[PDB]
Design a protein around this nucleic acid. Structure first.
Length: 928
RNA sequence: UAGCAUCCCAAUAGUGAAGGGAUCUAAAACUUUAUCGCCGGGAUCGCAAGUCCCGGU
């Protein structure tokens, strides 16, 4: 039933595919033994046998009777309704009538009730045959198949691809395979009309009719294999709820085309795998562990490639707005963008040095990591060279870059104080009372999140802690009523401590991690995990934990509980429980000692040219790679890298704190802001101190200014309006959400109110009022602009990672070709360098996704992922999009019914729009 | 293909290949303004999103 990822002899079993052979092994040891697992899976195969003989409704009496008759240890009416045969025993020298043994369990059960050794023999024979089949499947599951039939055919097709002879001659193989008769039989059976079962039966009939031809040649064997895959994909025998599978799927023409496409996809996957093996120099020895390490290295490299591509895009927006080199530079625009980024101003004489040091911080890392090899990570990350008509060489320790880096280092205390005041926990907690969290003797403020590969976010941890408290003996997580600004301050301070205080030392230290893991493991009694030793590093131990998780969701709950218990223990022990009781009402001493020399500036600048979300993604992947690593020098370099990411996170949200003098003038600000007013919401009381909106300044900083201006230029009555202004004054949002909480608690006490029409109408009206007020607030304070920028940047990063995959496969295939259409390259130049924000090509987001599908059409695993990425990103942003059929839109995917994802309240008729209908219109207009 | 994608192996060709595997592929899961009850079970959908009973606040 399931031969891997099962607990045999109290340990997980998994397959390791070597270059030759390929075996089943236990969780850790490398000893190649399939026989032990095959013998120990006897009970699982018995369960498979009973599930095969018993139909989908497994009624208890018949299931127990079958299990008792089948198993000696487990020994304790109509039959065909609960039933789901002529067979040959394994020890049959030849297949004929005299070895054609019976199976009619209905008659057997009727006879037994009238009163099954033959049935036991049938079960034993099936179990033995399935053991041998699974054993051979594992044994022949080599990495690069050569002696297998499919592997040999694939190798011949590789040879033809490398030469200029078209392989798998498809019309001829179809004609000599009798595809015409196959299609005629399938069409007749479909017209006659469990239709999938009948179509598969006719497929097997054609197989038996042409088996004397298809059993001797790999081309017909593989043709039948892909025909069977087509049948399972469109008319599944097992996946009943897939679709109807219309007669159009039976046409000779496109079944021909899909068979050819599957063969070509298999061939190209094989050639890219061979190129990967050649480039990584592991062709002689390919193991499961080696491929897992290569996969981790690949994923970290791809995340870093996306990060440095974002950095290159930001450098392009800073220096050369149109690109795909330094003479055309907008001095004023570069000065303004550099000021907005670095929170500091450079002179005109320093603009060339600034730009070229930015290039020397971004490009060399991209060049070093885009080439897949075992490279020294210290020499990869140090990067102390800045390149200057003529080319010179200076050092980042002799530029303004060092001064800015040291200013950020010294202002990290000031930056954390400013962020804490912006989220206003200062207004609730006293100075000396607050100071006792950064002054912990060992839990000093460190900007590294954690070496834990899967670091739970504060949102997830706090939500699960409230859920568990309301026995984990939790006493920290309480009062989840987000209406209270006291809770807002408490939540902000908890997030800050969690992210920049607790995890640093709770992850660089093993004792607290071990205590939390032990408590979480021993509370409930997550049986399939082991407790570590005192010398085991928590990073590597829980990297093993997450490896088990991503093979196999009990592991996510386990990790969340571990971090929850650790946070609770730290807060209780360090006398930090006062945060749970905010009371609204000097300076705070902030310890901050980090081991930064002048060699981290390059990564510092690259990080500074990224958004907070991309920086967090890069940090998470970097943590995963550091855990997967095994060298202490590289561990320290990635630790410094994580410290730099924390620096960027703390100083990323600096923004601007200037009046109309930030822009060119008052009229310039009016022109550039009314496109997205003189009253209180946008300008102060005096009418001449207009607050620079975070949305506007961020969208100008990240280069989405032109695209979002083009989007908001759709119509004039579409931005903030009198109705949006008035919706704020209609009611108090705090009172509205308090009433919603009261009504939710009322339905908590009595679910019957869900059937009361008046009460359900009142609750729906309250929900609609809350959603409308939140949308109106995001409109007046322009949070919609920020969210739209986040949407478009997330999409651009998704296509950038997809094109990183495309470039990886490109260079692998090129390397293998060397060892043995430019439209996609132009498309790479358009997408990977973020030229949409440039706007010269002028292709919408759906057009970009169609371009990504076109270039990534070389494999269906990415052709499908390109389409699914937009859907998943929009769903995670709170809105569902139903793509129209591609064949009806000339392969250019459009949008149909882009609707708000209805967060369901109380299967009932009440549902809350996670995003407003007007925001859905915004997203539709941006995409189209 | 739109939820189950993709790739590898698997010859008693009705023991249905109607098999197994994938940190070995790629999504995705994880990831610093929060309007969804939570935990602890059972049952059942190819399982997946989810569905129905059953319980404590």
């Amino acid at each position: 039933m399931r031969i891997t990822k099962v607990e045999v002899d109290r340990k997980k079993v998994l397959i390791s595919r070597d270059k030759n052979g390929g075996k089943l092994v236990y969780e850790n040891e490398m000893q190649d033994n399939t026989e032990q697992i095959m013998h120990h899976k006897k009970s699982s195969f018995y369960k498979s046998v009973v599930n095969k003989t018993i139909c989908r409704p497994e009624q208890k009496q018949m299931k127990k009777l079958v299990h008792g008759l089948l198993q000696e240890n487990s020994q304790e009416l109509n039959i065909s309704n609960f039933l789901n045969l002529y067979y040959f025993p394994e020890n049959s020298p030849d297949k004929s009538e005299e070895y054609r043994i019976e199976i009619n369990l209905s008659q057997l059960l009727e006879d037994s009730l009238k009163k099954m050794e033959l049935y036991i023999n049938w079960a034993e024979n099936y179990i033995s045959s399935k053991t041998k089949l699974i054993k051979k499947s594992i044994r022949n599951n080599r990495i690069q198949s050569t002696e297998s039939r499919s592997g040999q055919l694939m190798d011949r097709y590789m040879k033809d691809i490398l030469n200029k002879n078209k392989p798998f001659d498809i019309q001829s193989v179809s004609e000599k395979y009798q595809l015409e008769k196959l299609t005629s039989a399938l069409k007749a059976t479909f017209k006659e009309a469990e239709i999938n079962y009948k179509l598969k039966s006719t497929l097997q009939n054609h197989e038996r009719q042409i088996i004397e031809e298809l059993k001797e040649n790999s081309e017909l064997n593989q043709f039948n294999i892909e025909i069977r895959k087509h049948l399972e994909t469109y008319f599944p025998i097992k996946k009943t709820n897939r679709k109807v599978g219309d007669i159009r799927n039976l046409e000779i023409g496109e079944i021909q085309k899909i068979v050819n496409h599957r063969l070509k996809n298999k061939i190209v996957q094989r050639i890219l795998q061979e190129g990967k093996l050649a480039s990584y120099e592991i062709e002689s020895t390919v193991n499961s562990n080696s491929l897992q390490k290569i996969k981790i290295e690949e994923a970290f490299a791809l995340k870093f490639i996306n990060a440095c591509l974002f950095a290159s895009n930001n450098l392009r927006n800073m220096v050369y707005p149109v690109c795909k080199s330094f003479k055309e530079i907008k001095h004023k625009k570069f000065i303004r963008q550099w000021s907005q980024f670095f929170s500091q101003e450079i002179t005109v004489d320093d603009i060339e040095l600034a730009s070229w040091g930015l290039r020397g911080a971004i490009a060399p890392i991209r060049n070093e990591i885009i080439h897949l090899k075992k490279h020294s990570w210290k020499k990869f990350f140090n990067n102390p060279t800045f390149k200057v008509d003529v080319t010179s060489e200076f050092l980042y320790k002799e530029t303004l870059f060092k001064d800015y880096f040291y200013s950020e280092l010294d202002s990290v205390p000031e930056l954390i104080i400013n962020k804490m005041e912006s989220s206003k926990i200062l207004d609730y907690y006293s100075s000396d009372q607050l100071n006792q969290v950064f002054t912990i003797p060992n839990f000093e403020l460190s900007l590294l999140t954690s070496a834990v590969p899967f670091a739970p976010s504060f949102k997830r941890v706090y939500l699960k802690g409230f859920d568990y408290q309301n026995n984990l003996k939790l006493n920290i997580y309480n009062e989840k009523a987000f209406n209270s600004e006291a809770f807002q301050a408490q939540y902000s301070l908890f997030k800050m401590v969690y992210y920049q205080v607790f995890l640093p030392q709770f992850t660089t230290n093993n004792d607290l991690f071990k205590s939390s893991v032990d408590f979480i493991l021993t509370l409930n009694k997550f049986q399939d995990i082991r407790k570590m030793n005192k010398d085991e590093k928590p990073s590597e131990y829980m990297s093993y934990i997450q490896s088990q998780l991503m093979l196999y969701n009990h592991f996510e709950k386990f990790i969340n509980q571990v971090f929850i218990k650790g946070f609770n223990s730290f807060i209780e022990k360090n006398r930090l429980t006062y945060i749970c009781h905010p009371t609204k009402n000097d300076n705070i001493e902030i310890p901050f000692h980090t081991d930064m020399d002048d060699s981290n500036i390059a990564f510092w600048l690259m990080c500074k040219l990224l958004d907070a979300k991309q920086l967090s993604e890069l940090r998470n992947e970097m943590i995963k790679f550091s855990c997967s690593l095994q060298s202490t020098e590289e561990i320290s370099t990635f630790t410094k890298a994580r410290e730099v990411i924390g620096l960027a996170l703390l100083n990323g949200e600096k923004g601007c704190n200037d009046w109309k003098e930030l822009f060119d003038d008052k009229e310039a600000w009016k022109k550039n802001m009314s496109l997205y007013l003189q009253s209180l919401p946008y300008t102060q009381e005096d009418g001449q101190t207009p607050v620079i909106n975070r949305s506007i300044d961020l969208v100008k900083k990240y280069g989405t200014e032109t695209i979002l201006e083009k989007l908001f230029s759709s119509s004039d009555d579409y931005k903030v309006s009198a109705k949006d202004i008035a919706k704020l004054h209609e009611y108090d949002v705090t009172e509205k959400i308090a009433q919603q909480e009261s009504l939710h608690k009322q339905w908590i006490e009595k679910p019957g109110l869900a059937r009361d029409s008046a009460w359900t109408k009142k609750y729906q009206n309250v929900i609609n009022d809350i959603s409308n007020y939140q949308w109106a607030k995001t409109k007046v304070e322009l949070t919609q602009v920020r969210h739209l920028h986040q949407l478009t940047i997330d999409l651009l990063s998704r296509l950038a990672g997809y094109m990183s995959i495309a470039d990886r496969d490109f260079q692998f295939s090129s390397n293998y070709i060397l060892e043995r259409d430019n439209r996609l390259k132009e498309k790479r130049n358009n997408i990977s360098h973020f030229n949409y924000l440039n706007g010269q090509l002028g292709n919408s987001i759906l057009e970009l996704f169609d371009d990504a599908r076109d270039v990534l059409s070389y494999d269906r695993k990415l052709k499908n992922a390109v389409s699914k990425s937009l859907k998943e990103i929009l769903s995670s942003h709170g809105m569902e999009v139903t793509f129209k059929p591609l064949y009806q839109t000339n392969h250019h995917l459009k949008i149909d019914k882009l609707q708000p994802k209805k967060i369901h309240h109380l299967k009932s008729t009440v549902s809350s729009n996670q995003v407003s209908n007007e925001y859905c219109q915004l997203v539709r207009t941006l995409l189209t």
